[PDB]
Amino acid sequence: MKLAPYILELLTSVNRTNGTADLLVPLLRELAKGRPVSRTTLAGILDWPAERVAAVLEQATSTEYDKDGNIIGYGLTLRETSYVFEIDDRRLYAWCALDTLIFPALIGRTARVSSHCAATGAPVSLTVSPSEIQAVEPAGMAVSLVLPQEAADVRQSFCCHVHFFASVPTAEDWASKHQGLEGLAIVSVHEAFGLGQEFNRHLLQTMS
Numbered sequence: 259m260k261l262a263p264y265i266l267e268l269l270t271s272v273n274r275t276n277g278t279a280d281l282l283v284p285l286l287r288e289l290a291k292g293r294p295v296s297r298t299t300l301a302g303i304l305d306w307p308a309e310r311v312a313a314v315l316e317q318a319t320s321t322e323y324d325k326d327g328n329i330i331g332y333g334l335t336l337r338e339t340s341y342v343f344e345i346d347d348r349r350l351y352a353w354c355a356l357d358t359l360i361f362p363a364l365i366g367r368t369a370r371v372s373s374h375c376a377a378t379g380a381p382v383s384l385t386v387s388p389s390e391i392q393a394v395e396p397a398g399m400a401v402s403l404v405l406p407q408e409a410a411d412v413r414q415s416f417c418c419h420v421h422f423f424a425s426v427p428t429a430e431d432w433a434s435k436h437q438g439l440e441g442l443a444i445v446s447v448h449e450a451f452g453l454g455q456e457f458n459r460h461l462l463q464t465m466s
C-alpha cells in the first residue's frame with residue numbers, strides 16, 4: 259500500500275528526543291554482542307558525557323535494565339519476548355516484528371528470526387540480512403502495523419501491536435476484530451521489510 263505515514267511517525271518518534279538516533283545504532287551494536295551494556299561503556303563509545311547518555315535514556319521510558327542498572331533492552335533485548343533474533347548462535351530478542359526486519363542492516367549482521375502467528379499460533383521464521391529476506395516460512399507471511407502515537411510509551415503504543423502472521427488473509431481476519439487500533443494495517447513481510455529499509459535510510463541520514 260502506502261507506508262509513508264508509518265515511516266514519518268517512526269522517524270519523528272526517534273528524532274523527538276535529541277540524541278536518540280545517535281545513541282540507537284551504537285547501543286544496538288553493543289547489545290548484539292549479547293551482554294548487558296553499561297552507561298559508562300555507551301558514553302565511551304559515543305564520546306559523550308555521562309550526563310548526556312543519561313538524559314537521552316531518561317526519555318526512552320521502555321528501556322530495560324538489569325539488576326546492576328546496565329541496559330539490556332532497547333528494541334533489541336536480552337530478555338525473552340515473542341520475537342527471537344538469533345545472530346551467531348546467540349539468541350537475542352526483539353520488541354516487535356518490525357524491529358527484527360530493521361536491526362540487521364543497523365548492526366551489519368544476518369539474523370535467524372522466529373516467532374508465532376499472533377492469530378493462529380503457527381510458527382513463523384525467516385532469515386533477515388542487511389539487504390534481503392530469505393527462507394520466509396510461510397512464504398505469505400504478514401505483519402501488522404499501527405501508527406505510533408506522540409509521547410506514548412513506544413512499546414505499549416506500537417511494538418505490542420506489531421506482530422507476525424501466517425498469511426495476509428489470516429491477519430486481515432484478526433484485524434477485523436481490532437479496529438480500535440490507530441491506523442491498523444496489514445502488509446506482507448516483504449512490504450514491512452521495505453518499510454524498514456526506508457526508515458533505516460532516513461535514520462542514517464539524520465545521524466551526526
Ligand SMILES: [Br-]
Nearest residue numbers: 260261262263
Ligand atoms: Br500515503
